[PDB]
Design a protein around this nucleic acid. Structure first.
Length: 63
DNA sequence: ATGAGACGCTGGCGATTAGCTAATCGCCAGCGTCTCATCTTTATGCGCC
C-alpha cells in the first residue's frame, strides 16, 4: 500500500500484528492486486436474511 | 545543393453532495327518519289422473 494517525475507519491496516489500527493508527489505501468475482449470500437488514449476491472482491497484494 | 522524426498521478481515500423506497402498524371508514303505494314469496291448513 501507500507508505504514509488513529481513526475510526476500517480502511486502516494494522502496522504490526497485535497493534490495533483503531488504538494506534495504521496504513491506508491498499493496492488491489487483482479483483475476484464472487457469488454467495450475506445477511441483510435487521432480520439478517441470506440474500444471493454477486460482486467484485478486492484482493490486495498483501492478501 | 536540409533540416523532421521521440508529448502528464492516478487511484485511493475522504468527504462532500445528492436522494429514496420500503416495512409496520394503526385508523377508520355518511347516516338519520318517515310517508305512500306496489308486488311477490314463505310456515301451516284441501283435491288422483
Amino acid at each position: 500500500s501507500k507508505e504514509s494517525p488513529k481513526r475510526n475507519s476500517d480502511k486502516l491496516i494494522a502496522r504490526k500484528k497485535d497493534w490495533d489500527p483503531k488504538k494506534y493508527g495504521g496504513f491506508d489505501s491498499p493496492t488491489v492486486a487483482y479483483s475476484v468475482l464472487v457469488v454467495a449470500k450475506v445477511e441483510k437488514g435487521k432480520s439478517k436474511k441470506l440474500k444471493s449476491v454477486k460482486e467484485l472482491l478486492g484482493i490486495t497484494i498483501m492478501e
